Amino acid sequence: MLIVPYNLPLPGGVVPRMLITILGTVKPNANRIALDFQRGNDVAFHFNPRFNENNRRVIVCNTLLDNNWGREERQSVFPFESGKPFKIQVLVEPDHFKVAVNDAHLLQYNHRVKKLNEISKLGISGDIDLTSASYTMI
């Protein structure tokens, strides 16, 4: 069981056909989870399940550039459940990150950061027991 927050190096950044797989279990009474794909200090792709934003569950995605958040993209489909094991798969495609949870497609997030080969860390944080984090080329 990995320590959270957890940093997964992505050597040489990301590239299309790279698949990143995160396995974990959501804590009971979770508040948040975040996956941050980072280019140095910038966050190219922030993937942020929120379990109680005004008593609603929502996924917030965004990009942080020079310490400024951009326009949020919001998804009301919410596949996570407190207490339950999950699998997040992030497939890098040419124009977007494609995210599936528990083998069901969830969302896509268009690339705002263009230097994909400089997105060289994944930060995993929030209210989970983290089991594993890895990548493979498909």
Ligand X SMILES: CC(=O)N[C@H]1[C@H](O[C@H]2[C@@H](O)[C@@H](CO)O[C@@H](O[C@H]3[C@H](O)[C@@H](O)[C@H](O)O[C@@H]3CO)[C@@H]2O)O[C@H](CO)[C@@H](O[C@@H]2O[C@H](CO)[C@H](O)[C@H](O)[C@H]2O)[C@@H]1O
What, of Cl ion, ligand X, none, does residue 115 touch, CB below 5 to 8 Å by kind? Cl ion
Neighbours of 113 (CB within 10 A): 19
CA 47 – CA 68 distance, rounded (Å): 16
Chain breaks in the chain (C to N over 2.5 A) after: none
Nearest to 124 by CA among 23, 28, 30: 23
Burial of 94 (0-12, 13-18, 19+ CB in 10 A): exposed
φ, ψ for residue 116, nearest 5 deg: -60, -35
CA dihedral 37, 41, 44, 46 (to 10 degrees): 60
Nearer to Cl ion, 56 or 115 (CB): 115
Site string for Cl ion, 81-120 (x = CB under 5 A): --------------------------------xxx-----
Mask: binding to ligand X, 76-115, rule CB under 6 A, as x and -?
----------------------------------------
CB of 113 to Cl ion, least distance (A): 5
Does 75 bind ligand X (CB under 6 A)? Our answer is no
93 binds, among Cl ion, ligand X, none (CB under 5 to 8 A by kind): none
Binding-site annotation: residue ranges = 69-75
- Which residues are near ligand X by CB under 6 A? 5, 34, 36, 46, 48, 60, 62, 69, 72, 123, 125
